[PDB]
Design a protein around this ligand. Sequence first.
Ligand SMILES: CCc1c(-c2ccccc2)c(-c2ccccc2)nn1-c1ccccc1-c1cccc(OCC(=O)O)c1
Length: 131
Amino acid sequence: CDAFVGTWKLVSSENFDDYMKEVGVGFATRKVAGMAKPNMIISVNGDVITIKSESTFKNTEISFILGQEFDEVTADDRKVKSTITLDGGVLVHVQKWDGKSTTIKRKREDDKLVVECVMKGVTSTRVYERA
Ligand SMILES: CCc1c(-c2ccccc2)c(-c2ccccc2)nn1-c1ccccc1-c1cccc(OCC(=O)O)c1
């Protein structure tokens, strides 16, 4: 994950409101989150990866070891069972809750960190760059 490590800032978003609707996020949360411009602070210490984010919407953080499932409280307040793995240099993040699943992939592309969120056919792409 050496290439993921650092402080990242959101530079663009596409279809994130639709992805959120598909996830089940309610109107007001969708409006406020859609407006936010979160950063990501990604760090690695031994086998533990931490993804931290500060924004006006919410400050959240997850720490995890690849391949090992963990409890996650998402920024929209879902309690999910999550596993994050590395597949050919792509971080693959699967969230399970209420019989539902969503997969989020993060990859380095040129100088960008590209986040792709997928649920039931709806994809959002969020692009980050180094702060
Ligand atoms: C990056 C900050 C953040 C937001 C957010 C989104 C928009 C504005 C403000 C904050 C959310 C979120 C997800 C779904 C619904 C409502 C909020 N989760 N995290 C987060 C915070 C720590 C670790 C991981 C993740 C995360 C998990 C799953 C999908 C994600 O993809 C959104 C993106 O990469 O931009 C991001």
